[PDB]
Amino acid sequence: GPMDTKFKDDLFRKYVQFHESSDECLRVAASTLLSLHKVDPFYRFRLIQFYEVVESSLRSLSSSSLRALHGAFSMLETVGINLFLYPWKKEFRSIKTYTGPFVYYVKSTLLEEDIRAILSCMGYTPELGTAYKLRELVETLQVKMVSFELFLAKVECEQMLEIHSQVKDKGYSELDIVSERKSSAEDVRGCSDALRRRAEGRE
């Protein structure tokens, strides 16, 4: 079914409040939201094409993994947080992407067009494919919303890492885990149980 709006709205408000004032308590809530009431996987995200970006990364970028994706989404989340907290600062109206840790964590892991799409939701557009800049007036609510989905994305990577750990002896790839998680609305233990049973031949 649909995502729980009340739970999501409450979590969003607490996420913004937290940053305006460790996010582990927020991550526990996010982990609950991502499986709550058997929300369909295709309703977990509305601004990022999460499972498509993940599968593109795992298939196309050889250094990647769910761990690497966690790091890329975390770095992009921090870009968003800085922008909605400090939109007047030159260092966040123009961001550093062609050199520095952004190369190692994001360019290594997400396709260029997915970087561009995610950054566009924050109002960043590039020049010559780089030099991302906020060229129109900031829309902090939109920045907050995509930052929040990058937070959910990093947590969802944590969920899929956990699914894999619970069925780690059966020879599955991370791509196999992603396909179960996007196909089934079960929680983490449900997904791992299904993967185990399938590997055992029990359907």
Under 8 Å between Cβ of 84 and 140:
yes
The set of residues, in sequence order, having a beta carbon less than 8 Å from that of 149 and lying 6+ positions away, is 45, 46, 47, 48, 50
Classify 189 as helix, strand or coil.
Answer: helix
**Residue 125 φ then ψ, to 5°:** -125, 150
Burial class of residue 186 in the structure, from the number of CB atoms within 10 Å of its CB (0-12 exposed, 13-18 middle, 19+ buried): middle
Residue 51 sits in a domain whose CATH number is: 1.20.58.2190
Q: Which structural domain range is residue 56 located in? A: 1-203
The DSSP call for residue 94 is B
Which phi and psi angles does 20 have, rounded to 5°? Answer: -70, -25
Our count of domains for the chain comes to 1
Alpha carbons 203 and 200: distance in angstroms, whole number: 8
- What type of residue sits at position 197? R
Between CA 160 and CA 181 the distance in angstroms is: 7
d(Cα 107, Cα 62) in Å, to the nearest integer? Answer: 12
Separation of CA 28 from chain center = 15
Return the residues preceding each gap in the chain, C–N over 2.5 A, or none: 21
Radius of gyration for the alpha carbons in the chain, expressed in angstroms and rounded:
17
Resolution (A): 1.5
In terms of C-beta density within 10 A (0-12 exposed, 13-18 middle, 19 or more buried), how is residue 110 classed? buried
What angle do the packed helices 140-166 and 174-183 form, to 10 degrees? Answer: 120
Output b/e per residue, 85-96; b: 16+ Cβ within 10 A. bebeeeebbebe
3-state secondary structure 172-186: CCHHHHHHHHHHCCC
CB-count exposure of residue 77 (10 Å: 0-12, 13-18, 19+):
buried
Amino acid at the residue 161: L
